[PDB]
Every structure is written in structure tokens, then in C-alpha cells.
Design a protein around this ligand. Structure first.
Ligand SMILES: CC(C)C[C@H](NC(=O)CNP(=O)(O)CNC(=O)OCc1ccccc1)C(=O)O
Ligand SMILES: [Ca+2]
Ligand SMILES: [Ca+2]
Ligand SMILES: [Ca+2]
Ligand SMILES: [Ca+2]
Ligand SMILES: [Kr]
Ligand SMILES: [Kr]
Ligand SMILES: [Zn+2]
Length: 316
């Protein structure tokens, strides 16, 4: 909408207060004009018709329980935009400052979030499996990263390419969580998953097997559920990424860590310059090796560590 940029204040899903960029024109809308061509957050009103209505508020204060998922979807989309711009010199998901749209209060008791090809969509959860999923910065960044993937490598959402697609979203979701630097970890979704159970999460990158997912190619799933295991076999790539960053010895193979920043540079370059819609795990290894070679040199530690990490998870 046309209006003037304003600054509201509210509380997110976890009860934390934060400022949000809004737009005033009769109402205060969740429209952040400070980033690209805007970040826009919508109310889906417990229905499934998208996007719903641009979020309107009478007083620029967003402290109601109903407001909390919107506050966080809006704010964490901003953090994610900032990460891609400041760290990777990428302007929004398309690289040309496309408007970023999210809808919250999608459906009833909806235990998921997704990119629908055009926007992000967040359920509220059923209150037992999840609380509203936009409360997780890693989840928000995971979802927006699907848009980045779709505009770049275009990894098909099934089988190995789809597991790479998922892992890219978990990797950058985690790197955004570290960028914001509030309780960062290598787990996915811990802030919104199972409010009655402490210390768990949806997936672990450091130890995928803790939540049932493979950590070696010899344990990959090859059935048909979950689009051929895209959220399952992502554990193999997540583990490789974790080892590149943090190091470790895994199934007897030692990896010298190179840190999160270099992990992000290598995988961002692989995603945007080498991966294709049909890339498989072996092709991802080759893309990561080439990316690290471009950035750091063929004789570098970074190249050697990428190779060690993929060796450790059984990907040649
Ligand atoms: C319990 C769940 C939270 C776990 C998992 N989801 C995630 O980890 C995050 N959402 P996501 O990975 O973005 C969904 N992915 C998803 O819904 O993919 C289908 C689609 C394709 C094209 C258009 C619209 C939807 C899942 O879906 O099993
Ligand atoms: Ca209000
Ligand atoms: Ca965390
Ligand atoms: Ca996390
Ligand atoms: Ca929990
Ligand atoms: Kr982005
Ligand atoms: Kr997620
Ligand atoms: Zn995903």
C-alpha cells in the first residue's frame, strides 16, 4: 500500500519484544519499506485462501496473542533479507529485490510451514506438536531459502536433488540463526517444536540420527514417502555441512573444520553457480569442491575439508 514508513512494537511467539517496520495509511500495516521492494505480512485468518489480507492494526502496537505469529514472520523475514544482502550481496530471493510475502494463521492446527511458489506460509501448530512456526528464525529462514533455491539452482523437490534442496534450507536457516546470534545451534525448529518437551527439535544437523535421519549415504532412504525422503536424506548433507564448519571424526573419517562463514560462502556459491535442478549428492560434492577451489584455491585447507566431509558421509 502507499503510505509512510513507521515503526511499531510488539511481542513475538516466545514473548520477546521487538520493533517492526510498518506502513501507515489509515491503519498500520505489516509492510516494511526499508528492505528491497518491501516485506509484507498477511493474515490468513485460519483459512487456506492465500495470501489473505495484508495485516492491518489500528495503533501500531502488536502485543495481542493473535499478533505474535505475524510479528515474528515479519521480523525474521527482515533478518533473513539482511543476511542474504549483507553476507552474500544478494537482494531478496530473486536477486532483484522481489517483494517478500508471508501469511500467518494458515489453516487450523497446522503443523507445518512452506513456500508455495510465490510466498511463505506458516501454520499455528496444534499447540502440542508445534506452536506457531514463525517463532523459529531457522524455520523462517528455511522457508525463504526455498525461494532462493527455486530462483537459482532450481533443485527438483524429490529424491537426491530434493534432499539437497532441503539441506540448503536447513544450512542457511541455521546460518541465519547464527547471524541473529540468539541461542544459535545446529538443530532445526527447536524454538517451536513440542512445547511440552525440552531439548528436542525437528532435525539435528550435528547428529541427524538423534531424530531418525541418516548420517551416511549407506543409510539413505529410497522409498517413496516424503517425496523420496527429502526431509530424511537431507541429514546426510546436513551432517557434511556441519563437519565442514565445525570439524569432527565421523565413522572414523576426520574433518578439519573451517567455520560457519566459509561454509556459507562455499554452499552459496555452489547453489548459485554450479547446482542444477537434477543435481545428485555426488554432483553436490563436485559443486562444493569447485566452489571452494574458486574461493580459496585448489591446494587450500577449505578444499581438503570439503572432501573429508563428503568422504565422512560416504558421498564420492
Ligand atoms: C513436521 C514438518 C514441519 C517437517 C517437514 N517440514 C519442514 O521441515 C519445513 N517445511 P518445508 O520443508 O518448507 C515443507 N515443504 C512442503 O510443503 O513441500 C511441498 C510443496 C511443494 C510445492 C508447493 C507447495 C508445497 C515436512 O514437511 O515434513
Ligand atoms: Ca494493535
Ligand atoms: Ca536456537
Ligand atoms: Ca536452530
Ligand atoms: Ca520441544
Ligand atoms: Kr532472501
Ligand atoms: Kr524447518
Ligand atoms: Zn523445506
Amino acid at each position: 500500500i502507499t503510505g509512510t514508513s513507521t515503526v511499531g512494537v510488539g511481542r513475538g511467539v516466545l514473548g520477546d519484544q521487538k520493533n517492526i517496520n510498518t506502513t501507515y495509511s489509515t491503519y498500520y500495516y505489516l509492510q516494511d519499506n526499508t528492505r528491497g521492494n518491501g516485506i509484507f505480512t498477511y493474515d490468513a485468518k485460519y483459512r487456506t485462501t492465500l495470501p489473505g489480507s495484508l495485516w492491518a492494526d489500528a495503533d501500531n502496537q502488536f502485543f495481542a496473542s493473535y499478533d505474535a505469529p505475524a510479528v515474528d514472520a515479519h521480523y525474521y523475514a527482515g533478518v533473513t533479507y539482511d543476511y542474504y544482502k549483507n553476507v552474500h550481496n544478494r537482494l531478496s530471493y530473486d536477486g532483484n529485490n522481489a517483494a517478500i510475502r508471508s501469511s500467518v494463521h494458515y489453516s487450523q492446527g497446522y503443523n507445518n510451514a512452506f513456500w508455495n511458489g510465490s510466498q511463505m506460509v506458516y501454520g499455528d501448530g496444534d499447540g502440542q506438536t508445534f506452536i506457531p512456526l514463525s517463532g523459529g528464525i531457522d524455520v523462517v529462514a528455511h522457508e525463504l531459502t526455498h525461494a532462493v533455491t527455486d530462483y537459482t539452482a532450481g533443485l527438483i523437490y524429490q529424491n537426491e536433488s530434493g534432499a539437497i534442496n532441503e539441506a540448503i534450507s536447513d544450512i542457511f536457516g541455521t546460518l541465519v540463526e547464527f547471524y541473529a546470534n540468539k541461542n544459535p545451534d545446529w538443530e532445526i525448529g527447536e524454538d517451536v517444536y513440542t512445547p511440552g518437551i525440552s531439548g528436542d527439535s525437528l532435525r539435528s544437523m550435528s547428529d541427524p540420527a538423534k531424530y531418525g535421519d541418516p548420517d551416511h549415504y549407506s543409510k539413505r532412504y529410497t522409498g517413496t514417502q516424503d517425496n523420496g525422503g527429502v526431509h530424511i536424506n537431507s541429514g546426510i548433507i546436513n551432517k557434511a555441512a556441519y563437519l565442514i564448519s565445525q570439524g569432527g571424526t565421523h565413522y572414523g573419517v576426520s574433518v578439519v573444520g573451517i567455520g560457519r562463514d566459509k561454509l556459507g560462502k562455499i554452499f552459496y556459491r555452489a547453489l548459485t553457480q554450479y547446482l542444477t535442478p537434477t543435481s545428485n549428492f555426488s554432483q553436490l560434492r563436485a559443486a562444493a569442491v569447485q566452489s571452494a577451489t574458486d574461493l580459496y584455491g585448489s591446494t587450500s585447507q577449505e578444499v581438503a575439508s570439503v572432501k573429508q566431509a563428503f568422504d565422512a558421509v560416504g558421498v564420492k
